[PDB]
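Input for the complex:
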Amino acid sequence: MGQCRSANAEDAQEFSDVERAIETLIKNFHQYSVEGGKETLTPSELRDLVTQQLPHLMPSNCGLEEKIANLGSCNDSKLEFRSFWELIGEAAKSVKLERPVRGH
Amino acid sequence: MGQCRSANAEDAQEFSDVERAIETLIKNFHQYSVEGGKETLTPSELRDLVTQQLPHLMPSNCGLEEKIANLGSCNDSKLEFRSFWELIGEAAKSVKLERPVRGH
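Predicted:
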């Protein structure tokens, strides 16, 4: 892409374990939002990032179009960076610290 | 029952670099929920992890108490793992990648 790249905040590592972890997820929207124009994602690059990033959560064994069907109800604002984060709020129901008798 | 600490994916190396990072951030809830019974949270362990582990994300010179004031509207449910994840949504309203088009 282009003739230049940025370097500020592009590794984010002066921070604590949790305080770099949240940036490590947010980075992964910014790296993939290239045809959603950095303002948003778009469904066809949502489909492409999921098959690379989520092998333990959501492999190509189902149609990733089910994830598009959950967030695609916006029409004026479209898939802003919170629409990436709300699928991590779905991931954290299936991936969190492996506890004896996991909850309730 | 007991004071054991043991778990799994405690080193995490097979996952994608975002997929390890959801675990590595959410670990910090199951670490600090010490009065919270591993499934809920309380304002003192909230104050304590925000001063030690969000030293860039919410400084003492703003008052830590503002991040208790965010969760302070909900009481009938008690606190939840959800109530911590609801706060990280506001961490991402402060923290993004340092390129143009962060939002509006």
